[PDB]
């Protein structure tokens, strides 16, 4: 399969290039594939990589193009004036703009297939959308096509949608190339910045909530939400997936599922993106969500995550019950047997299920992975699969038998429908992990657990206290251990309003820590402790970030090397009142009085490109690793997109910009 036209190194500044003689009437069947390796010199405006049109007066709605917007959206149009058919197919956040002050080379493609009546778009190895349209047009369907151009669309004798940049290579084919070919053709250096990808070894099409941490031995470790039924928080199925690098982030292991339930199979699902359809959710599998990592002094690694029973929504679930009882001064996880109204059972020593009415052991037990046994034998339930037949969502028992689990909707004994926190530990730096441990009811018996602030925890240097950031919706909850993580306590700090106070900590000097957090007022807040987290100041606010009221998670870390002779912190956050966009990395230098001089910043891409949750780590070579949601993860227009959580790196010199 060879192109009808191939051109190289065409640099343009808005004016385009006529290629009518080299394309006229070459699209014999009418189908097409166009593969464009380009970089933009300017992102501003609506720009067409190529345009095939009727250029005559009155025929300005007769064209085909592939376009780029200043927010990284890749799209195509196919329109015919006389039939009044107007097709637009696109996906937000498909391309990259700039990286470290240089234009990024992307490779994109469009495929139009008349037999299928589909338009497909590809960006950097990913098929970002394929859509079947009733009013499909191929090139032969559009009347009086007379003008074929690079970097523009000729409409009524004028160049519209002028491209600014270089078309490094452009190929036009007069047929619909197959998906695997086009994926391969669009694969490039950008593709290699995805650690997690759609339908990799996680089975998930979607990801959110990345976390990076560098261990004491030099291994760089990542965790992330693998979200199977679109990118919805709830209801969904979510697992925590992990991947690591032992060469300073150059190469990563194939992702593994590290915290996962198996009530629902971890399968690749094509979640709909249309208005209305995109609100679809599954009925809900048991869920792990929002991971937090810390390495202990002794090199053991902890990972925490929120746990939600299957079908339980974070909005509706009960705030007035911890899911525990206190009996003889011990905290036991309580259970309700199917058919009962009361919670008459507790999981006690060795996982034995007791009847609290009689205070005697039953035939039932629960193992350390929440699985239920009767007389020493596992009870089972049948796993669910989700599918699209057609195009309706179906959930069904799929023939796989899995252990019955107290978090499942089909369990004979069930936990309270509320949120919990679990942690697991590793003694080999992330290669293998213990069974989970649910946090005891540190908020009290009559309150739900807190929600974790995704990112890392810290070890405060003077006391060795371990601190894990969390929040309740009205308070900060700083979870801590003073015995190297054997037992856990909490400091609960009331907040000025109902902030989703996802926080991260830094240590300014021994005993002095600051908690940086999301608010509901548009600003980033920070609270200060001068006694290793025992007491906290009133909030203060960064002066230079102005976001929407809903806010976004942030990442802030200590950096080990001096910058301008000073101890430094590094912050990552969006900064825009218009959405989750305009990602910035800020360098803060610690002054002698423990205030911070926010001296430098670097915009991660152009300001209208998407930037939501993020995570920073210092690499062992003292470069900075960043993984982030390169899209607006709040927007209802950017839900359920594949391959949008990249990893990139910076040298400090890349970041020391602007002042
Ligand atoms: C890709 C896109 O958004 N194309 C639309 C057309 O589908 C149509 F809506 C039109 F009106 C037009 O020019 O024909 O406007 C443009 C465009 O919004 C504008 O030119 C603003 O640059
Ligand atoms: C972030 C998000 O806003 O994008 O929100 C968290 C909470 O929903 C937050 O309270 C909303 O303000 C999500 N976590 C949970 C537990 O819902 C994050 O995963 C993320 F979705």
Residue numbers in the entry: 83 to 741
Q: Which sentences did the original study use to describe this structure?
A:
S. pneumoniae produces up to three distinct sialidase enzymes: NanA, NanB, and NanC. NanC is an unusual sialidase in that its primary reaction product is 2-deoxy-2,3-didehydro-N-acetylneuraminic acid (Neu5Ac2en, also known as DANA), a nonspecific hydrolytic sialidase inhibitor. NanC adopts the same overall topology as seen in NanA and NanB, with a CBM (residues 85–271), followed by a catalytic domain (residues 272–740). The catalytic domain adopts the canonical glycoside hydrolase family 33 sialidase, six-bladed β-propeller fold shared by viral, bacterial, and mammalian sialidases.
A covalent complex with 3-fluoro-β-N-acetylneuraminic acid is also presented, suggesting a common mechanism with other sialidases up to the final step of product formation. NanC crystals soaked with 2,3-difluoro-N-acetylneuraminic acid (2,3F-Neu5Ac) presented continuous electron density from the ligand C2 position to Tyr-695. 3F-β-Neu5Ac was covalently bound to Tyr-695 in an unstrained 2C5 chair conformation. The covalent bond distance is 1.9 Å. 2,3F-Neu5Ac was also found bound in the CBM binding site. Equivalent complexes have also been observed in the C. perfringens sialidase NanI, the Trypanosoma rangeli sialidase TrSA, and the Trypanosoma cruzi trans-sialidase TcTS. Tyr-695 was confirmed as the nucleophile by soaking a NanC crystal with 2,3F-Neu5Ac, capturing a sialyl-enzyme intermediate with 3F-β-Neu5Ac covalently bound to Tyr-695. The electronegative fluorine atoms at positions C2 and C3 allow trapping of the covalent intermediate by respectively providing a good leaving group and destabilizing the formation of the positive charged transition state required for enzyme desialylation.
